Each structure stands twice: as structure tokens, then as C-alpha cells.
Subunit: 331 residues, 3 copies
């Protein structure tokens, strides 16, 4: 262990992923990561709705950390003195101490370094879990995911290699924002001030917002994910507290590790997949048609009314064999 190569990796904010190789380069190594926890107010919709976010590395969701099976993930978690809450981290990819949550409880002004062997391959969720207030921190955006790639990269049901040209991390967040008697969303001074009202909303099990990358439309318009005809894309998706059902309108999930675990054969030709709360999944797809696509949570109410919708701008040539308008909309 002590003789293993140590490698520091620079993280990038989602939906983008930091530099990495699908197939492992070299032997096992201790991959070092560092994340600063930021408690800050963020606007989650076009109506100026604020949320006292608790974010790993300052983003909702936290950045995607990529390592290979049997590598060690050594994370340095820092909680600035400017924060008002104690935080920790639970890596679903880790084994022991509640995923590491019991070994990383840091108060404002403290940091900690946790190391764990990524023994299982797949996309895993990680989240803050302070004893007594687990749901609150998580639904406040304090969660993300990591990808433990098999040493030999991805493969389909029959060992055939699956290599993606691009990879996007879509973190889905269910928010529970309190509203006053008039139906208007409330704003609070400090995070703690919202606790009571937030819990009452949480118990209804009905989120007020279900978003991608921290806000409604965060992945639409000019911030739409891109691709080209013939391009192979891996779309990692996560939900740390509630179920979701990803769907690529106009496309499919050619290979979908619905459970997120690479040793579990992927489903194929998926129209809509399911990811349970507290888990991550990965869908592989080769775009065949150009144009705009809508990647959504297929409970269309949560998608188009609550905000769980994203876009894909794909360049290339249209394929009239696959689809064609024989007669355009006419009288």
C-alpha cells in the first residue's frame, strides 16, 4: 500500500468530468482528491427561489470522481470556519464506518483525510450524513457520485468493449422549499432557520423542485450537453434520496447499467430506465440523428412542471431511413 503511486487529480464541475482513462493506466494507485465544502444561497428557478445549499466543492451535485477498481481514493475534505454546520461524507463505494461518514465528521474550521479501497466497479453515490440530520444535508444538495471504472474499461454483456467518446454526469436533486400562507417560497437568513419548515415539507415526500445540476434549466439552452452523429456518450445519473427514471427523448439507452454496477450486465435498447433513491446509474448511447434531444426524468410532471429536464444538441446528418416525414403537417 505505502509503495503505491500517489496521484492528485484536478476536479471539474458537473456535468463535465475530470481527465481520466477508461482503461487503467499503470498499476493500482492512491488517487488524491480535495473538496472544500461551501454553504451558500443559490437560486433554483426563474422565480428567484433561494436554497441554502450545502455543496461539496461548491457545486450541486458534487463533482464526479473517477478511479479504477482496486485503486485507493484519498479525499481531503475541508470545512471552512466560515461555515456554520458540521459535515462528513458517506461514499457508497466504500466499505466501513458508514461509508466513511463516521471517520470524517468535521466542524467549521476542520479538515480530514479519508482513504478507502475502491473494491467494487460501478457508479456510486456519495453524500453528507451527519448523524441526526442525514436527509436535510442530502436534500440541500450535499451529494454527488464517483465512478469506479473496471481496470479494463467498460464491456457489454458478452465481454465486447464499450468505449465512450464523451461522458456527462447528471446529478438529480429533489428540493423541498417551504412556502408561506400565500403560496410564496420563503427565504431565510441562515441554513438553520429553514430546518423546521423544511422538514415539514420533506415529510410530505413531495419535492417542490426536481432539478438537474442544481437548477431548473441548468442543462438547457446554451448550457445543453453536446454530441455528434456517430458519437458514443456515457451519461452517468444519480439521485441520493429519491427515485428517478431517466429517458432520452428521441433516443435510447443502448446499454444501461441501471443498478450502476459494472459487474451486473447492462440492459439493452432501453427506452426509460430506473434508478432508485440512494443510487447511481450509467447509460451508454451512440447518437444516430442530429437535432435537439430532451433528457428527462420520465415522470413528465417532475420533468416539465418540477424542472427535471435537460437538452442535448447533436450535430450531423439526418437519417431518413431511421425516420422521415412522409407528409409534413398539412390540411
Amino acid at each position: 500500500i505505502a509503495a503505491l503511486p500517489r496521484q492528485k487529480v484536478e476536479l471539474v464541475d458537473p456535468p463535465f468530468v475530470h481527465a481520466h482513462s477508461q482503461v487503467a493506466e499503470g498499476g493500482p494507485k492512491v488517487v488524491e482528491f480535495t473538496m472544500v465544502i461551501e454553504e451558500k444561497k443559490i437560486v433554483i428557478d426563474d422565480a428567484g427561489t433561494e436554497v441554502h445549499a450545502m455543496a461539496f466543492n461548491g457545486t450541486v451535485p458534487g463533482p464526479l470522481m473517477v478511479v479504477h477498481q482496486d485503486d485507493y481514493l484519498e479525499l481531503t475534505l475541508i470545512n471552512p470556519e466560515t461555515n456554520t454546520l458540521m459535515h462528513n461524507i458517506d461514499f457508497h463505494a466504500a466499505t466501513g464506518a458508514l461509508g466513511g461518514g463516521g471517520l470524517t465528521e468535521i466542524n467549521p474550521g476542520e479538515k480530514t483525510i479519508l482513504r478507502f479501497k475502491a473494491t467494487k466497479p460501478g457508479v456510486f453515490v456519495y453524500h453528507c450524513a451527519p448523524p441526526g440530520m442525514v436527509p436535510w444535508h442530502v436534500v440541500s444538495g450535499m451529494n454527488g457520485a464517483i465512478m469506479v471504472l473496471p481496470r479494463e474499461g467498460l464491456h457489454d454483456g458478452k465481454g465486447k468493449a464499450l468505449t465512450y467518446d464523451k461522458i456527462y454526469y447528471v446529478g438529480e436533486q429533489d428540493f423541498y422549499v417551504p412556502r408561506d400562507e400565500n403560496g410564496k417560497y420563503k427565504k431565510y437568513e441562515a441554513p438553520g432557520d429553514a430546518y423546521e419548515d423544511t422538514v415539514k415539507v420533506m415529510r410530505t415526500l413531495t419535492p417542490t423542485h426536481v432539478v438537474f445540476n442544481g437548477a431548473v434549466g441548468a442543462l438547457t439552452g446554451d448550457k445543453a450537453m453536446t454530441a455528434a452523429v456517430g458519437e458514443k456518450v456515457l451519461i452517468v445519473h444519480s439521485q441520493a434520496n429519491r427515485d428517478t427514471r431517466p429517458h432520452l427523448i428521441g433516443g435510447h439507452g443502448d446499454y444501461v447499467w441501471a443498478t450502476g454496477k459494472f459487474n451486473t450486465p447492462p440492459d439493452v435498447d432501453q427506452e426509460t430506465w430506473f434508478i432508485p433513491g440512494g443510487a447511481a446509474g450509467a447509460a451508454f448511447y451512440t447518437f444516430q440523428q442530429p437535432g435537439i434531444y430532451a433528457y428527462v426524468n420520465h415522470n413528465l410532471i417532475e420533468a416539465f412542471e418540477l424542472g427535471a429536464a435537460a437538452h442535448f444538441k447533436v450535430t450531423g446528418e439526418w437519417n431518413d431511413d431511421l425516420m422521415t416525414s412522409v407528409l409534413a403537417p398539412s390540411g
Copy 2:
């Protein structure tokens, strides 16, 4: 493609499926279908509760279209002048232009003809998706499903052929009917009139009714599905906007393509399967016992309080080896 044989198919109302062959009869063909959109009031319960349904071919759900892999489904969608809204169709089985929704936007008085190559085998959902009014149209019953059978028919995980004697299509719909201040369901003289009230109910993510084939008890009594001991039946099930967990009371799902995709091996000996919102699944089962069966969404509250329950009247001889009353209810 122009040289490919063409065949006009006659659609039938669910739970029945139009004539077709499990094994493809000949090479790829352009299978033609035609559906007229009908906006109509439908009564969903014995309390007289009405819903302004937007139905493909006049039924909720829309009719099941059957084709084989690599065939071309050419649909002529018609929106009569008698309608008030613009409609389109998204085939989850299709690839490109938002499943076709982007090429099929027809206003009242218009029609369009869309053709796509059914490249992936399985049961797929199809539904209307007008930009900005997507969920509303879907929860108004404007959705259905199609089945792209493999050229060589159905097979289990080990390649053994699975030939069914009967096939049924159960479309499950989640309605959100507004109520006045007295708890009485409201009635409207027009679709647009209910819109505002409906959206508010939709946002609670709690349907007022969850029904099979458009209404409570729709598939019972005169409309109870039939079978006979020894008969093999395929029960196709769809839910375009919300999760469901089909269960045959008194029976099982011998083979269940939970994801609805035939290239994804079916689960076996299922008691209750799960179909996420925005997808369709299929269950193959051979009846062993005579009598009535209850096909339900296994959230017993949704099944028996909300309306998600159907029946099966099976004929045949009882099997005392499988089950027997050693001591009938007595003192």
C-alpha cells in the same frame, strides 16, 4: 424502402390487439397505421367523475400497434377540425426528432404521415408531447404503446421459443381530477377550462385516480379478460408518466421483460414486477388454475382505492396438487 412491401393494418381497441403473426411473415415491410385524435369527455368512476381525454384513435390508452424488428411503421395521424388543441406523437421506439414529436405537430384540421424504422425489439410507449404542454396531454390519456416483435418471435433467456396463445394490452393511466372546496370532483365544459386546476393537482404528484383502460372497473365483468387453464398469455402493460408494479393475484409472471426490451433477458417466476413511468413491460404466463384472477398495480391503495384493478376469468379444471382446501373455513 420504396420497393419494400406495404401492409395496411386495422387497429382494435385495448385490451385487444390487432391481428399479427408472432414470427415475421416475410422480409421487412412498411406497416401502415392510421389514428384519428379525439378529444372527448370520459367518465372514470361510478361517481360520475369526468376527464377531458385526448385520445389516440378514440381510446385511453391508444391502440397497441404491432410490427417486427426492422419493419417501418408509417403512421398517418389525423387531428380533426373538431379538436381545439395541437397534438403530435412521440414513439419511444423511434429514433430522431423527439421520437417523431418534432415532425408530427398538427393543428386541428391537419394531418401528417410519419415513418420510422423499428430497429429495437420490445414494447415501447408512445404519447403526445406538445412543447410546453407535455405532461398535461399525457395525463389526459393521450398515450399508448407499440410492440416491435423479434423477426423470429419471442424467446426466453436460453433461446427457447415462447409462443403465446393470447395477448392483452393494459394501459395504466394516472388522472389528476380537480375538486371544489367541498371535495366534489369538478366538471368542465372544455379542456382548456380545466387546465389551470389540473396543473395544481398534477404538482402534488398524487393522482386522484389510477385506472386501467380509462376508468375504474373498465377491465372487469363484461370487459374482464379471458383465459383457460393451459393457455399462455402475454400481458403488455404501459404507464407513460408514472411508476407501476403489476401483479397477477393467484398467478405469476413466468417470464417478465420488466424493461419491456426483448434483447434484455426476462425475469422469471415473478410475483410482482416494476414498470417505471415512461415505459412498458410484458409478462408471459401459462394459467394453471381456473377461476377469477385480479391483475393489479400492487400498491393496494392505488389498486383498490384509486381504481387500478382488472380481472381475468379463466376456465378449466382445478388442480388440487397445486392448491387444495384441506379444511374449509369452519369452527
Copy 3:
């Protein structure tokens, strides 16, 4: 059948399971069980909230009956004179008469004996189902599960034997307890007085309590489940009416029969699995780290707010290779 050996089994209260063999002891036999139905007031939390439970063998959930494939489960169901309602039982593992429900309808003062062939291997849910009062009986705790082990014990998806050292049965219950105008849960003299109000809550599809083994924290403290480093544990989990997503915080589900059916290959390296309402599942795990583990329903709100959280006390030596605190929380 009469010539087959018979064995009377003494059931034990969950989360424990009665003595049995993983690999079948000889040939097919008629395994006899007896359960007396008890309508009783139970407290579901520390505040003293009571529920007029309907419990098989007097426990919520009912006890786990264990037999082998092709064995005959002969159950003597007794409904005491002291009871006020008619009860029956629906074995999801059984084939015919609504899972046995239609042949076991017994009124207070009556008993019945039902026998069915356990033709399919896996864990199955069993619950009361009085026609017209189905969901009310189930959400009142009248449900449990059975395990039909393959005659050759468990095996992974590749045929390698999977022999557990311990086995626990976690029955998850979704309760719908009415509240008064002050938000305080209501208490009733007779269960009948609760029906109307309870039905109202049930219709919201939002349980007030989601608990393991009949109450919040029922499987914690001195009642916490136990294991040791290197010990293989099988955790059978069931939910007869609502979805759940089991997760062992700090561990994984090495082999998980998410559908609960043994003839369906298990998913591996699971972080969080999914069990649809009206079904049971099983997870196999070999502990590697000592300490406390939280076995929860991963919708953290349901887990830590609603009561779906259990504990595991694991003895043994810490494995620093798997996980270690390089730097404990410090400045």
C-alpha cells in the same frame, strides 16, 4: 401427497427465522405451520402512537415460513372469537384461488387449513386480503413473507454455491395514522372507529410512518441485528404495499435477488437495491468491517424521518486496507 412425510414447524418472531436447512433434507414433504390472527393495539413510536394492528401470529410483520421448492406448505390459519373481522391469506408463492385468499376466508371463531405446492423458488409476500377491505388490512400490518429455497440451496448467477451463516427477515410497514387538528396522531377505542379517517390518509399515498418490525427503531439498540467480520448474512426484505430501496450504510449487497426470485440471476455489488410494493427481495453480504451499520430504506426522509432505519452491530477487527483515517478531523 398423503404418503409424503410431514413436519410441524415452530415459527419464530421476526427478524429471526425458524430453524431450517439451506439444502433440502431429503425429498418433498408437507411442511406444516399454524398461525393465530390477533387484532391488537401496538405502539409504533416513542411518542406512544398506537395502531390497531391485524397481525399474523401476533407480529408485524408476520413470521417467515421457510420451505423448499416442490414442498407442500400446509397452513392452519385460526381467527379467534375475540377478533371482530373476517380474515384470509394470499400467498404470492401459491398458484390459484387468489393466492389462497378465496379459500381461506374465516370469520372470528373459525379456522381453516390450506395446502399449496411451493413450485417456484424465492422469497414471496403473503398478506390478508378480505374483498373490499384489502389495502386496509395490509397497511394495518397483516402481511409477511415466506422463503421457498431451492432444494440445492442458494447459488449465484454462475452456479457457485452461496451458503449464508445467518439470515434475518426485515418486514417493512407503511402506516397511515390519522392526526387531529393539532397535528397529533389520533387514538381509537375500536379499530372500526379508525377506518374512515385512515382511508383518507391512505388516499394521500403518503405514509406517516415507514417502519421495520412494527415500530420506529424496532431493530436498533439491544434489538439491533448482529454479525461479525467474515460472516455471510442473508437479509430478506418485504413490503406488501409500497416500494422500498434497501441499503446497508457502510456495506453493500454482494448478491441481491432484487425481484426476490432465485431463478432470476442476482445483481452484484449493489449499493442500493429496489423492491416494488407487493414483493420481497433478498440480499447476501459478507461483512468486512466491524462497527455499527445502518440498514435503511434509502429515501433518507423515509429512513430517518419516517422510521425506516435498522442497525447492525458487527464485531471483529478493523481493516485499514479497505478504509483508514489518514487525518482525523482537525484544524
